[PDB]
Amino acid sequence: MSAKDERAREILRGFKLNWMNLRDAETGKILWQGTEDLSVPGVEHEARVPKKILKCKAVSRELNFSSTEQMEKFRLEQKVYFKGQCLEEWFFEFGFVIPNSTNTWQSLIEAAPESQMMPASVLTGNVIIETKFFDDDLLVSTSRVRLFYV
Numbered sequence: 001m002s003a004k005d006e007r008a009r010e011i012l013r014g015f016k017l018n019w020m021n022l023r024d025a026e027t028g029k030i031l032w033q034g035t036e037d038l039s040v041p042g043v044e045h046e047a048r049v050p051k052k053i054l055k056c057k058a059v060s061r062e063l064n065f066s067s068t069e070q071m072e073k074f075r076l077e078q079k080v081y082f083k084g085q086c087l088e089e090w091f092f093e094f095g096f097v098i099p100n101s102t103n104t105w106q107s108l109i110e111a112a113p114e115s116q117m118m119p120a121s122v123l124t125g126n127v128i129i130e131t132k133f134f135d136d137d138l139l140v141s142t143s144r145v146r147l148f149y150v
């Protein structure tokens with residue numbers, strides 16, 4: 001192992017996702033909320049979202065996290081797979097994280113204008129979100145969530 005592998009593990013160790021929610025960006029209405037740390041790697045998490053989320057033009061996510069470790073450029077890469085095929089890739093930057101801080105991170109997730117959504121009934125249980133946590137180019141964790149539309 002290198003210093004960077006050790007550092008990634010230290011960050012993971014100090015990290016906790018405390019709560020999260022999703023809102024319709026246009027109306028502000030709450031679609032989903034949870035307190036399960038979906039960032040925990042090595043386990044396939046599940047989440048149930050209302051099927052009307054697929055009609056939204058944009059979704060606002062609020063994500064609350066704690067970190068014992070300082071981070072220079074905290075960021076996420078998320079890949080949206082349907083039956084193993086990547087259909088969307090999202091990138092979000094938080095930036096600098098104070099050691100032993102708790103932070104609320106708001107992001108906007110926008111519908112790709114190129115594409116049209118398959119129906120909820122087709123998508124449900126066949127969508128995996130793969131999320132990669134980075135400090136800059138240091139990969140901290142990789143986690144998966146399987147989505148159901150209800």
Ligand SMILES: *C(=N\C)/C(CCCN(CC1CCCCC1)S(=O)(=O)c1ccc(S(=O)(=O)N(Cc2ccc(Cl)cc2)C2CCCC2)cc1)=C(/C)O
Pocket residue numbers: 017020022032038039047048049053054055056057058059061063078080081082087088109110111112115116117123127129131145147
């Ligand atoms: C392809 N389209 C070409 C699709 C569409 C499904 C993707 N999402 C649709 C909405 C995206 C923005 C515009 C409005 C439509 S989705 O509703 O299925 C959706 C919404 C939110 C998220 S998530 O915020 O990434 N997230 C998963 C998550 C995991 C780990 C962390 Cl750390 C944070 C967040 C939430 C999902 C429910 C729990 C949390 C993902 C997908 C497809 C499927 O191919």
